[PDB]
């Protein structure tokens with residue numbers, strides 16, 4: 001007898017780690033769990049085709065930002081029962097509980113699986129040399145800039161490469177998401193969409209949203225991000241950091257894990273970067289301190305022929321023991337608030353910085369149309385990055401691009 005589960009690649013050998021995780025459940029319930037791994041790049045299409053066709057697995061992983069769109073299709077089984085058995089609303093951060101439903105829905109359609117948020121990895125060796133105090137560089141936008149300026153000047157060189165380091169690496173290729181940009185929007189007092197006057201509307205062209213975007217994009221334009229980083233995507237920037245080309249880059253907690261895995265195992269423990277690794281939160285902007293808070297949930301399709309067994313599996317995967325074990329293999333944080341006290345999270349000084357940074361975690365609203373909003377936003381942001389590649393991103397050029405993005409988002413939202 002067989003349960004089918006789709007996941008994304010959350011760990012170096014993602015199917016083996018998932019199968020190890022569920023072996024106790026399989027033994028206790030007389031069932032086999034067959035897992036399929038979908039790359040993040042294609043998972044949306046396969047999940048959407050499963051949703052409209054009625055041909056799919058019992059359970060799928062969903063990125064928290066996808067729950068609303070899949071739930072609005074009317075294909076997910078209610079899971080209020082599972083969430084109650086896990087301890088209900090009080091067992092989760094509000095930012096995690098919001099991702100359990102479509103915004104405004106009265107019924108839960110996803111079970112929190114793991115959480116992740118974004119912070120700055122830095123080279124302790126590169127900053128020590130450049131004379132940069134990390135507590136100062138990551139406190140404020142002002143500090144951040146002054147720190148990249150000291151890093152750009154530095155004669156420091158990677159021992160493996162023998163070359164200087166880029167102060168900051170961030171991808172300039174049209175992004176899949178706003179996860180890199182949203183902290184700058186939010187720190188300025190901006191937002192992507194805002195609910196006001198009975199309706200959701202774009203806020204990407206607000207003065208605050210434009211101030212934060214322009215701060216971020218202009219770092220690349222003032223030589224803090226080398227030309228070659230503007231031509232790279234998130235994956236090619238991670239590789240660059242691992243290989244000693246970057247002093248500072250923003251990512252999720254999984255880099256700590258990858259950094260303890262040898263290069264032969266899909267990791268980078270033997271590189272200088274892994275041996276000189278610091279983590280610092282996003283700096284405070286003029287209007288506050290925010291980072292992207294994300295993660296993945298698990299949903300049950302309402303056409304599953306195995307709903308009872310699937311719900312025992314969601315309860316298993318959602319519960320404390322499996323929450324710690326899966327976080328240990330993935331480098332993510334558990335979804336369940338209580339599981340953060342595990343010594344495996346509290347005795348890792350880099351992970352404790354992510355834990356502290358979650359106070360400033362901010363999530364997107366769980367809207368049916370969220371994918372189309374982010375898609376329109378990233379297409380226009382990619383045009384702004386192409387102006388950066390020319391030295392021609394002006395406050396007026398950014399505003400005209402974000403005015404076109406707002407008109408097309410406002411259009412999509414009605």
Ligand SMILES: OC[C@H]1O[C@@H](O[C@H]2[C@H](O)[C@@H](O)[C@H](O[C@@H]3[C@@H](O)[C@H](O[C@H]4[C@H](O)[C@@H](O)[C@H](O)O[C@@H]4CO)O[C@H](CO)[C@H]3O)O[C@@H]2CO)[C@H](O)[C@@H](O)[C@@H]1O
Pocket residue numbers: 009010011012040062063064065066116177238239252254255258266293294295296330
């Ligand atoms: O927008 C959709 C959802 O996004 C979730 O964030 C995901 C993110 O989209 C995804 O791209 C990211 O995947 C990383 C993966 O890129 C990384 O890859 C390794 C690679 O195996 C290795 O060869 C290379 O050298 O290094 C890379 C870095 O280690 O692997 C890790 C696992 O080890 C993946 O997690 O993961 C993000 C977190 O799941 C959002 O969280 C969600 O809110 C959103 O809806």
Ligand SMILES: [Cl-]
Pocket residue numbers: 191192193363364365
């Ligand atoms: Cl927002």
